[PDB]
Amino acid sequence: KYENGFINAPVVVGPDATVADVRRMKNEFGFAGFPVTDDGKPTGKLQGIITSRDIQFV
Amino acid sequence: TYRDAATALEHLATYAEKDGLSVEQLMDSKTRGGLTYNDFLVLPGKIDFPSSEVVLSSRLTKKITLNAPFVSSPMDTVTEADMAIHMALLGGIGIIHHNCTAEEQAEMVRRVKKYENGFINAPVVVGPDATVADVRRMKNEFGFAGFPVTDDGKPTGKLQGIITSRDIQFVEDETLLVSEIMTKDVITGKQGINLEEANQILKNTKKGKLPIVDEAGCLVSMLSRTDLMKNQSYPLASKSADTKQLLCGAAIGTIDADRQRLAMLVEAGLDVVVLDSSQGNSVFQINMIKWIKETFPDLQVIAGNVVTREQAASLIHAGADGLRIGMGSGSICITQEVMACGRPQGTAVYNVTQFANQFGVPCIADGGVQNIGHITKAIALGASTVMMGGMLAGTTESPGEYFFRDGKRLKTYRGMGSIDAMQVAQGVTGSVIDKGSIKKYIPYLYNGLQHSCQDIGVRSLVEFREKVDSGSVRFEFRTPSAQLEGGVHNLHSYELFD
Amino acid sequence: IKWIKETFPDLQVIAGNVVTREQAASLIHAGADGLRIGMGSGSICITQEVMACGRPQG
Amino acid sequence: TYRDAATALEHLATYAEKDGLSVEQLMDSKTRGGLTYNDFLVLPGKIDFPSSEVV
Amino acid sequence: PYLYNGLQHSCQDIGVRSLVEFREKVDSGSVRFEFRTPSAQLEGGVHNLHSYELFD
Amino acid sequence: TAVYNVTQFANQFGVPCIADGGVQNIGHITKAIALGASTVMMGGMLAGTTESPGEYFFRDGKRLKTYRGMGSIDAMQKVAQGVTGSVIDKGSIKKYI
Ligand SMILES: Nc1nc2c(ncn2[C@@H]2O[C@H](COP(=O)(O)OP(=O)(O)O)[C@@H](O)[C@H]2O)c(=O)[nH]1
Ligand SMILES: Nc1nc2c(ncn2[C@@H]2O[C@H](COP(=O)(O)OP(=O)(O)O)[C@@H](O)[C@H]2O)c(=O)[nH]1
Ligand SMILES: Nc1nc2c(ncn2[C@@H]2O[C@H](COP(=O)(O)OP(=O)(O)O)[C@@H](O)[C@H]2O)c(=O)[nH]1
Ligand SMILES: Nc1nc2c(ncn2[C@@H]2O[C@H](COP(=O)(O)OP(=O)(O)O)[C@@H](O)[C@H]2O)c(=O)[nH]1
Ligand SMILES: Nc1nc2c(ncn2[C@@H]2O[C@H](COP(=O)(O)OP(=O)(O)O)[C@@H](O)[C@H]2O)c(=O)[nH]1
Ligand SMILES: Nc1nc2c(ncn2[C@@H]2O[C@H](COP(=O)(O)O)[C@@H](O)[C@H]2O)c(=O)[nH]1
Ligand SMILES: Nc1nc2c(ncn2[C@@H]2O[C@H](COP(=O)(O)O)[C@@H](O)[C@H]2O)c(=O)[nH]1
Ligand SMILES: [K+]
Ligand SMILES: [K+]
């Protein structure tokens, strides 16, 4: 999973998740590029994306 | 029969003195005299706070204060730009060596000052007629890839767009012009805006840069997102309160030629100068000090080296803003064996600072420092900061090429008085073991000093200074047997950080 | 120490480590039933070199 | 508060003795006695001449 | 000449222009001294190096 | 001798062979391939590099990493045919390889 062309089952986050949750996810995986789906599942409806820049200075 | 335990604290008053020695009694030679760090200990006190609460704010000079009492020595095997940059970021400061041409030293100072910025002065720019090949050559040279695009290719030119690493990153045709690949619509800040205002706009855009332009649309300055990141990652960084640039120190001699050298260092943005000498109490250095205060009145001057009260008085009278203490205490130094002249570092620090502190002149304890214990004791005896040479040699930020010998990873470390460096030697050439990055090593020293203050029962170095002078902090001599017992002993083998 | 004497009054408490008169007085006042003396005197210990803090054991 | 630096040389007179020991005090055994070269140092002073001038 | 030059620099650091002056300033108590504990002697010499290598 | 005699047989079946063990330098790699090996396996040479697990410690004035055989008692504990030892630091394999 270190290098991909098409990433399978990318890590995602729900809209109701907090910045605290996203930072905890960044430390764990550890990247900060999580698309946002409505149900918080990888197969869910895309509603946006959150990146490192988005949470860097929150 | 036995006294009631409830009377334990009250019974302490029946004793004429607190247990252990005052700093006065310790250094009241006597009987015994001429001691160094390893000859004594600081006795523990009362803990009523966490070590994380301990403040290590320290005066480098009259007007300069650091968040940590750590100073890297001006030696060609310890402090160049890389060293000085990271010392400043981690709350200390670096003194750039002068075993080099004036131009080379000024360049090192300049790189330290330009490493972090608030408003970038004269940012690197590119013209629209430049090629991708040119931009890549610029990236390699500076090297950063964010360049605003001006019509004339001057920092003061009319802004027409911006070129970033992402823009050139996967361009196959290097002949393409900047005008073709650049981003034309760029968010800018208006001239006259202050730093806090400019930063917010930058934070809102989420872009790499924020160019500042005048009403005519000409570039005047620029912000960088990474500067905000650097501030966030290094909140204790030693920086100018106005420019946000890292503080930088540099060493010079006291000959007439160093006047031109210093002028070049000041132009590069030097914040503090160290007059480098094994015996600073000279007419030569005194004249240099006087010349600096009238020529560069805003430049802080550290004089030295000194080890006696008389030396200190002489240079303080000359106008020194700080003092460098140590003669022969250096790991790679031999002045005492060659000149018969020097002083045990512990006694030197005490007797000099006992005089100098009365004048609000901070003193650097220079040489003989190898561990956290040495740092604590130096400060206990009156030092405001400690200078480290050998301890920082062999770190990745140190300027050296690692070589292998005796099955050990080594870096060369040499005294500035050694014949090799000058090319009667007062230093020698040697090697030191690898230690890794100071990004780990300095926080270890920082954390260690906090715990040391905690055990002693002081919440800051300011408090530490006060409680020692008042006789509240207590000390104890170490016989040769006590020192062996104090260190590792009676083991077949043994293996601090990481 | 105080919490132990009121919770487990029959339990003997040894406090420490200490090396000064003042430390001893403090913990004795707290109710210590015994004291442990030593700081840096340990064969495998380095507190004195790392903390600049300790005392010759004698 | 801090003393004025201009009074630094004048303030030296408030001390009973110069910093360090006299040769008499060094060799006034005592306590300590029976020392050799490696047991002591000479403290530095004031430089107002080049070493080449030394006779 | 190395010893000669070295002794000149040593006199300079002490602040005396000759051995005659050196003798006088010591006897008058102007030249000052300091004991060296065993720790100070180790600190005064080369210390804490993996290896090391005066004249020539 | 092991690499030569095995590969002289294995090459006839198009089966590539790894030369595992005894490799310490570029010369060993060359000779192993010369004798018929298709690749070389390195253990000790890569131990002590930054990308290798786990943590460095200092002994005898040298920066070391623990290096042990899978047949050592320590390894089998989560008749020994291996031992536990140490190797010097080597830095990143991004430079070493
Ligand atoms: N997304 C993605 N594309 C890749 C990756 N590796 C190679 N490619 C694409 O594969 C194509 C050709 O790659 P090539 O240069 O032959 O190297 P190779 O794919 O590593 O064999 C190019 O379009 C690359 O951008 C990867 O890790 N991720
Ligand atoms: N963002 C993300 N990256 C993944 C995932 N799984 C594997 N990766 C890889 O991890 C790397 C992360 O990209 P990077 O730009 O370094 O970090 P990010 O921008 O914070 O996501 C890429 O090379 C991905 O191919 C995943 O679920 N999410
Ligand atoms: N781009 C740029 N950076 C500078 C200049 N002068 C100093 N710097 C510093 O270099 C750093 C730029 O790093 P970064 O923005 O990540 O690199 P870039 O995105 O490729 O420009 C900032 O911290 C600046 O303070 C300059 O003229 N141009
Ligand atoms: N629209 C617009 N694009 C910009 C601005 N600043 C930079 N860009 C472009 O957006 C892309 C990403 O730039 P940036 O994130 O600053 O580059 P990085 O610092 O290399 O990550 C590049 O193609 C830039 O030319 C801006 O203010 N507005
Ligand atoms: N652009 C920029 N702003 C800075 C820098 N250093 C401090 N600041 C700003 O100074 C203001 C005060 O922040 P401050 O509390 O000093 O943060 P700290 O320096 O981490 O303690 C904030 O707007 C910071 O963003 C820098 O290097 N660059
Ligand atoms: N006399 C003398 N002192 C030196 C020389 N090089 C470095 N020093 C001193 O030794 C200190 C470094 O000591 P270390 O940190 O290695 O124990 C420096 O701060 C500097 O004052 C030299 O060549 N001669
Ligand atoms: N018999 C035995 N072989 C081992 C053990 N541990 C490792 N080896 C082998 O020794 C090789 C290591 O060779 P090196 O690169 O250290 O010279 C490994 O690739 C593996 O094949 C062990 O405990 N017992
Ligand atoms: K010990
Ligand atoms: K020395």
- Quote the tokens at residue C15: 């406090």
The ligand placed nearest to the CA atom of residue B211 is 4
Distance from chain centroid for Cα B22: 31
Active site amino acids of C: 45
- Quote the tokens at residue D11: 């303030």
DSSP summary character for residue C37: E
Provide the sign of the torsion angle of the four alpha carbons B63, B67, B69, B71, taken in this order.
negative
Interface with chain F: mutation pick from B370, B405, B432, B498, highest number of F CBs within 10 Å: B498
F76 Cα: distance to centroid of ligand 7 (angstroms): 14
Compare all CA atoms of chain B with the CA of F56 and give the residue at the minimum distance: B498
Instruction: Round to whole Å and give the CA distance between E42 and E44.
Output: 5
Buried b (16+ CB within 10 A) or exposed e, F27-36: eebeebeebb
Angstrom distances, CA of residue B372 to CA of B276, B438, B484? 25, 14, 17
Helix (H, G, I), strand (E, B) or coil at E38: helix
Helix (H, G, I), strand (E, B) or coil at D20: coil
* CB proximity B452 to C under 8 Å: yes
Buried b (16+ CB within 10 A) or exposed e, B384-400: bbbbbbbbbbbbbbbbb
- Residue A52 has phi, psi (to 5 degrees) of -60, -40
Domains of chain B: 1-116+235-498 (3.20.20.70), 117-234 (no CATH)
Ligand 6 site residues (CB inside 6 A) read: B 73, 75, 278, 305, 326, 330-333, 335, 366-369, 387-391, 415-418, 426-427
Q: Are A50 and A34 in contact (CB under 8 A)?
A: yes
Identify all chain B residues contacting F56, using CB atoms and an 8 Å cutoff: 498
Element (H, E) at C23: helix C21-29
Instruction: Round to whole Å and give the CA distance between B312 and B410.
Output: 37
Parallel, antiparallel, or unpaired: how do β-strands B403-405 and C34-37 relate?
A: unpaired
Identify all chain A residues contacting B229, using CB atoms and an 8 Å cutoff: 56
Pocket test for ligand 2, best of A2, A31, A46, A55 (most atoms within 8 A of CB): A31
- Measure the CA angle with vertex B463, ends B457 and B467; round to 5°: 70
DSSP summary character for residue D40: E
Tell me the sheet residues that pair with A44. Answer: none
B112 Cα: distance to centroid of ligand 6 (angstroms): 23
DSSP summary character for residue D47: B
Residue ranges with strand state E in chain C:
14-18, 34-37
- Quote the tokens at residue F51: 């990308």
The partner residue sitting opposite D41, judged by closest CB among B279, B313, B341, is B341
Q: Sheet of B429-433: strands edge to edge? A: B403-405, B408-414, B429-433, E51-52
Using alpha carbons, select from B466, B478, B442 the residue that is nearest to residue B380. Answer: B466
Angstrom distances, CA of residue B48 to CA of B45, B51, B457, B458, C3? 10, 10, 8, 9, 17
- Measure the CA angle with vertex B142, ends B133 and B263; round to 5°: 140
Q: Are B127 and B178 in contact (CB under 8 A)?
A: yes
Q: Do D19 and B313 touch (CB under 8 A)?
A: no
Residue C38 counted as an annotated binding residue: yes
Cα atoms in the Cβ-side hemisphere of radius 13 Å centred on F25: 1
Pocket test for ligand 6, best of B36, B75, B97 (most atoms within 8 A of CB): B75
Instruction: Round to whole Å and give the CA distance between A44 and A41.
Output: 5
Provide the sign of the torsion angle of the four alpha carbons B43, B49, B50, B52, taken in this order.
negative
Parallel, antiparallel, or unpaired: how do β-strands B363-366 and B249-252 relate?
A: unpaired
Give the list of residues 6+ apart from residue B442 with CB closer than 8 angstroms, or none: B68, B70, B86, B87, B90, B91, B92
- Determine whether the shortest distance from the Cβ of A5 to ligand 1 is under 6 A: yes
Angstrom distances, CA of residue C12 to CA of B4, B345, C8, C25? 17, 47, 9, 18
Identify all chain B residues contacting A48, using CB atoms and an 8 Å cutoff: none
Residues making up the annotated binding site of A for ATP are 11, 31-33, 51-54, 56
The ligand placed nearest to the CA atom of residue F67 is 7
Instruction: Round to whole Å and give the CA distance between B87 and B92.
Output: 5
- Determine whether the shortest distance from the Cβ of A45 to ligand 2 is under 6 A: no
Q: Do C54 and B6 touch (CB under 8 A)?
A: no
Q: Are E43 and B336 in contact (CB under 8 A)?
A: no
* CB proximity B317 to D under 8 Å: yes
As a whole number of angstroms, the longest Cα–Cα distance in chain D is 46
Helix (H, G, I), strand (E, B) or coil at F57: strand
Instruction: Round to whole Å and give the CA distance between B306 and B350.
Output: 12
Tell me the sheet residues that pair with B341. Answer: D42
Nearest-CA residue for ligand 1 atom 26 is A5
- In DSSP notation, chain A reads --S-SS-SS---B-TT--HHHHHHHHHHH----EEEESSSSTTS-EEEEE-HHHHTT-
Distance from chain centroid for Cα E8: 10
- Quote the tokens at residue F55: 């943590």
Tell me the three-class secondary structure of chain B, residue by residue: CCCCHHHHHHHHHHCCCCCCECHHHHCCCCCCCCCCHHHEEECCCCCCCCHHHCECCEECCCCCEECCCEEECCCCCCCCHHHHHHHHHCCCEEEECCCCCHHHHHHHHHHHHHCCCCCECCCCCECCCCEHHHHHHHHHHHCCCCEEEECCCCCCCEEEEEECHHHHCCCCCCCCEHHHHCECCCCCEECCCCHHHHHHHHHHHCCCEEEEECCCCEEEEEEEHHHHHHHHHCCCCCECCCCCCECCEEEECCCCHHHHHHHHHHHCCCCEEEECCCCCCEHHHHHHHHHHHHHCCCCEEEEEEECCHHHHHHHHHCCCCEEEECCCCCCCECHHHHHCECCCHHHHHHHHHHHHHHHCCCEEEECCCCCHHHHHHHHHCCCCEEEECCCCCCECCCCCCCEEECCEEEEEEECCCCHHHHCCCCECEEEEECCECHHHHHHHHHHHHHHHHHHHCCCEHHHHHHHHHCCCCCEEECCHHHHHHHCCCCCCCCCCCC
Q: Are D5 and B317 in contact (CB under 8 A)?
A: yes
Instruction: Round to whole Å and give the CA distance between B4 and C29.
Output: 9
Alpha-carbon radius of gyration of chain D: 17
Instruction: Round to whole Å and give the CA distance between B384 and B70.
Output: 10
- Residue F43 has phi, psi (to 5 degrees) of -110, -75
Q: Specify the experimental method.
A: X-ray
Give the list of residues 6+ apart from residue C6 with CB closer than 8 angstroms, or none: none
Angstrom distances, CA of residue F29 to CA of B391, F17, F48, F94? 39, 13, 19, 18
Give the residue ranges of DSSP H helices in E1-56.
2-14, 19-27, 38-44
| Preceding omega of B351 cis (within 30 degrees of 0) | no
- Determine whether the shortest distance from the Cβ of F20 to ligand 7 is under 6 A: yes
Q: What is the dihedral of CA B103, B109, B111, B116, to 10 degrees?
A: -160
Buried b (16+ CB within 10 A) or exposed e, B300-330: bbbbbbbbbbbbbbbbbbbbbbbbbbbbbbb
Distance from chain centroid for Cα B299: 16
Whole-angstrom distance between the N-terminal and C-terminal Cα of chain C?
A: 26
Whole-angstrom distance between the N-terminal and C-terminal Cα of chain D?
A: 46
Distance from chain centroid for Cα A44: 13
Distance from chain centroid for Cα B205: 35
| Preceding omega of E45 cis (within 30 degrees of 0) | no
Nearest-CA residue for ligand 1 atom 1 is A5
Q: Are B410 and B403 in contact (CB under 8 A)?
A: yes
Q: What is the dihedral of CA B476, B482, B488, B492, to 10 degrees?
A: -170
Tell me the sheet residues that pair with B144. Answer: none
* B333 classed as catalytic: yes
* CB proximity B63 to C under 8 Å: no
Distance from chain centroid for Cα D3: 23
Tell me the sheet residues that pair with A36. Answer: A13, A48
Distance from chain centroid for Cα B344: 24
Q: Are D5 and B361 in contact (CB under 8 A)?
A: yes
Instruction: Round to whole Å and give the CA distance between B478 and B480.
Output: 6
The partner residue sitting opposite B282, judged by closest CB among D8, D41, D47, is D47
Instruction: Round to whole Å and give the CA distance between B402 and D23.
Output: 48
Parallel, antiparallel, or unpaired: how do β-strands B219-224 and D40-42 relate?
A: unpaired
- Quote the tokens at residue B67: 């968040």
**CB within 8 Å of chain B, chain D residues 1-55:** 2-6, 8-9, 11-12, 15, 18-21, 30-32, 40-48
The partner residue sitting opposite B327, judged by closest CB among D30, D44, D46, is D44
Instruction: Round to whole Å and give the CA distance between B91 and B57.
Output: 9
Using alpha carbons, select from B376, B389, B385 the residue that is nearest to residue B415. Answer: B389
Helix (H, G, I), strand (E, B) or coil at E35: strand
Pocket test for ligand 7, best of F17, F20, F24, F96 (most atoms within 8 A of CB): F20
Alpha-carbon radius of gyration of chain C: 13
Do chain D and C touch: 3 or more Cβ pairs under 8 angstroms? no
Which amino acid belongs to residue F64?
A: L
Which amino acid belongs to residue B315?
A: L
Instruction: Round to whole Å and give the CA distance between F32 and F16.
Output: 13
Instruction: Round to whole Å and give the CA distance between B209 and B198.
Output: 11
Q: Are B272 and B94 in contact (CB under 8 A)?
A: no
